[PDB]
Symmetry: D2
């Protein structure tokens, strides 16, 4: 069989929509027929090769792909034909290293990554390791659930590692794909939410989704504004694609506070070490989520606590989507629709 | 009515040994007769007034003073005349704020600091808040115990917040004033210790103190070496916080590990986003510790698990001591001896 | 000079409403004019003289008393006259023992207890230690806020130590004074709530307050019912006044689950050690709440996440109230109203 | 084709040493050649059908088998022929449930148990799940390391879940098979150890093992004595879970402390509600541990920190070994030696 897929063949170049072979599932593998496929900013980073560790060319991006198990190899019991599943960033892990045994498989040094080191969901079919796919809730459709496969799980875990508790203030910096669902997860976790971005439309989105307070960093110093407004936050989750937002976030927290980092813009960010030490601040990188994180994050969507803001696009228009996302002209998430 | 003391009357100017009034305790206060008083780099910064918030002039430095309770004001029960106590960095906290109520008095924004914002232990007597003094162990001398009020509790708390466990690997970065004490706490906390420095003398000291591994970063890349040799460290205590140490720490820590920063350097440090996020690294600021932190750290000294390298000097020679410290000629810690 | 107050002058006997002197505050003390005063089930035992350690006669019960500071002793800074305050079970703690230094003053062995070891709020005025009173929010009435002083802060802390997190199930056993507000805190902390009691009306109250499911332990074996309905809970908070309910709670959790204990019926409860060990179960006593806990719990009420179901009664009818409480004829809390 | 093995063919009856087929490994399985095989009280309960859920007959007991990997089915990468491994209590788990995904495979409700629900190590060979075998340290012999698969990991994990930290007091209740090993882990974990038993010889053993204090409960009340002498222990490990040990544990622990139960006794225990709640005490069931726990516990043995008292016996004499066990004649641990 042949299939349509969007392929990266050179960093910086537009993706090409080509006919490629349908991947077949070997032993212990499953095949997934894609019905929807979220566009993550990471996909831009990957196609631009602006990260230290590059994807091997060529490749098909996409780690927010969801659909049906359309075929099953041998020795597979976790899922069966017809099951609704998603294939996330964490494609697979070794399962027995120290990290994996501790239930921190997101840290597995032997992990594979969907739509980066292996081909992803920007296509009609994708092969997956059934041991690491998301098991989708029956009551949420493909288009709405797709973003939870990365945006959702990531910020859910990110919020967990801020070490904030119900009643406390958390700041979400960057109300994009990750950010806009981050606001919703925070409320579901009993947190009071403040939002920071550089575009009023984003802040308006945050306001609708539960943000009690919101500030535009292009209009004022957000750190100073937040210190005055709420006395500083107990936690911050940075999803912004700007190193500047990382530095600013550090000045947003109360003493003893924690800043968790999701965003992956190239380079360093300026860190006021003196204040971090004097104020006992924690800065903490968070990387997607374990299978347990993933399952829990899907359950919040299933219960209606989190609903992704989504607009659809066609596979063929993937380069336009990339352009819009790059220009910050996307509200929430774009999901590629493969439905009939 | 009068006592000798080393007084800062102008930032940068030599301290003068003056006759000044013995401070007398009012209600809820105590008086301490100093037998020994530790010196460290923080005293230089107080005397130079080169930190963001300066001491008020004139003032008596010293946050490592130890001695006997020589008099009490009314309504004191925690201690009595004749008790052996130290008057550490945390002179007092408000006791009512969110931080104080949570047992994190070190983060109190209304805290006072001994030998910085109030008069300290560079004198024959000092008035203190008995609610915040350290209660000293019987079986350890004043001179030997003094540095535990600072270096001790600092590296102890710092090691605690790396969130490591017995059997796990911790790197002690820098085996100087703080580091040589740190190696001892780590060993007593059941940690496997790797010492990193640029000086073979200090690395050999580390080995004497129980370091299982020692690597000289002048010759070899401590990060590459440790990742290979022990798979990276679960924790990293950075006692000399320089850009190189900071960045090498990020390289030495294994994924999911924690880096605790034990120093107050000037300027912003470039923090690499990609590495912190994808390695799920925690970077945590930590200096001194709470009252309970301090008592716990003293217990280690009392049981002979921790002993600071100490040399004595006279109060009258403090300027000479400051000079030696500035030039980096001080091995271990210098302690002013008030005993006849 | 004189005030009205319900006094316990001999155990097991009716309380006598008498005129007694008004207590005056000395140094470090404040006087409080009572506006409302919650009746805790604990008060029944203070008066029966029921417990291992008994109050001393004669005494005035009541540790849910709220009102205004009407007089301030010497050396008090935390509060001033006119301040809205409440006087909880934890009347005072020593402030410097190991527990107190760790922000666990509820464990202080030198603590005093309001309406037990010292006189409480079943009277027009009560003297308190200003360092341990609750600072009440302006936007909640005295009658509604009164239960938060014990019922509220207790179950809030109890829920904290179930070690449950958003999305997970918690069971509230006993939907009384503590229980009916526990359901609400649970919801505010992002938990899904199941309710257990022995009276359909109390279960219906839980449901109206946010309980998703409910079971009458008189009608079926709760535990088996809960294992079937929700697959066991992640945590349980037991406020019930029956040892039986403690034994049943143990069987209500998933493996790895935690049961927190608040209720204080006399004697032992049957514990299946074999299952507790095989299933890795945790059983944990929880004792009111620290000042931090209390302020946090008052905040939930201030924001309207929590609202006590209360009936009022006159001080003079306190014996009638006791009777009804003892018979389980009370809906939520009864609060003594001193409103002129 | 054939091998010797001890088989339970009827509950209560002597084991019969038979010649049975050597088990061959299918895909995902490995075969282990046994060199040593630990014996403990759990084997008695397996042989007696003593417990609620019984083994199926006939079966080969033994959950402490160690040896070489002698054959490797298809799709195995964790281990290879010649690898020195152990086949502990947790033969396998489902790997997909809530518990397995969270790194708590010990709580898997679909787990299989070696030498209980599947054939174990009381034979020359045994087939195992490579994903769940213990990877044995190079420097420790088969006989010495065998008990660590059981007693070792149990007491290590048990100590971990006391939530104590270095410098803090831990009580080891019972210095027998589990206890003498627990004392060693405790010291290596930096804990101050108080040993409690009723046998002076076992108490002397504890002291020589590093116990700082030892109380004989025949002659003195250990609760009152320890409360007076060390202000209660922060943690208590109950290795011999009898009602008396349980109740005394509750009296020995300091307020806020944690009691970890390491045994599987019959029947309900009377738990004092008042003491547990008022003292804020945690009671916690813990036996064996995860794969991560086992590997950590194995490292302590590899470093010389922990050594089980071991004596050997032959497979043919297992019934006699059982005899001694039953009568309580066994000091330390007995290990079957299969070596030439
Ligand atoms: N660490 C992980 O596990 C993980 C997983 C997924 C994505 N990511 C990262 O997420 C980031 C982007 O995620 P995305 O899908 O939401 O992309 P993006 O299109 O969705 O979201 C952009 C957001 O950051 C923007 N932003 C730019 N400058 C800002 C500033 N100064 N302050 C506040 N906000 C600012 C905002 O416009 C906001 O839209 C990084 O690009 C990277 O892809 C990390
Ligand atoms: N540990 C603490 O810090 C703390 C603080 C306050 C009160 N308490 C305790 O709270 C308990 C009750 O408090 P209260 O103020 O809510 O009084 P209570 O009258 O209000 O509450 C009774 C509740 O438990 C009852 N109940 C009886 N048998 C039951 C069973 N088998 N299963 C489930 N529920 C059952 C229910 O009727 C329900 O009303 C104890 O009486 C004790 O006083 C503890
Ligand atoms: C006491 C310190 C801040 O150095
Ligand atoms: C291995 C154990 C259950 O004893
Ligand atoms: Zn992504
Ligand atoms: Zn792995
Ligand atoms: Zn110092
Ligand atoms: Zn304060
Ligand atoms: Zn009460
Ligand atoms: Zn106290
Ligand atoms: Zn065993
Ligand atoms: Zn499982």
């Amino acid at each position: 069989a042949m299939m349509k897929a969007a392929v990266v063949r050179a960093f910086g170049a537009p993706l090409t929509i080509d006919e490629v072979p349908v991947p077949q599932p070997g032993p212990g593998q499953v095949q997934v027929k894609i019905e929807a496929s979220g566009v993550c900013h990471t996909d831009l980073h990957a196609a631009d090769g602006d990260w230290p560790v590059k994807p091997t060319l060529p490749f098909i991006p996409g780690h927010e792909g969801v659909g049906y198990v359309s075929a099953v190899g041998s020795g597979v019991s976790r899922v069966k034909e017809g099951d609704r599943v998603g294939v996330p960033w964490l494609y697979s892990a070794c399962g027995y290293c120290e990290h994996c045994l501790q239930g921190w498989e997101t840290l597995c040094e032997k992990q594979q990554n969907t739509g980066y080191s292996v081909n992803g969901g920007y296509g009609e079919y994708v092969v997956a390791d059934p041991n690491y796919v998301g098991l989708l809730p029956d009551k949420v459709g493909f288009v709405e659930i797709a973003p939870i496969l990365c945006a959702g799980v990531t910020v859910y875990k990110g919020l967990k590692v801020t070490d904030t508790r119900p009643g406390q203030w958390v700041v979400i910096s960057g109300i994009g794909g990750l950010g806009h669902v981050a606001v919703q997860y925070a409320r579901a976790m009993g947190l009071r939410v403040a939002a920071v971005d550089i575009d009023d439309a984003k802040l308006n989105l945050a306001r609708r989704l539960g943000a009690e307070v919101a500030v535009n960093a292009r209009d004022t110093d957000p750190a100073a504004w937040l210190q005055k407004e709420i006395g500083g936050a107990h936690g911050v989750l940075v999803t912004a694609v700007s190193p500047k937002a990382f530095s600013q976030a550090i000045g947003m927290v109360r003493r003893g506070g924690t800043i968790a980092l999701n965003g992956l813009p190239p380079g360093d960010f300026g860190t006021p070490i003196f204040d971090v030490v004097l104020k006992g601040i924690t800065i903490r990188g968070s990387i997607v989520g374990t299978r347990s994180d993933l399952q829990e994050s899907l359950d919040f969507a299933a219960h209606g606590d989190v609903k992704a803001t989504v607009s659809t696009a066609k596979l063929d228009d993937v380069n336009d989507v990339f352009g819009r996302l790059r220009e910050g002209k996307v509200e929430g998430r774009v999901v590629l629709d493969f439905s009939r």
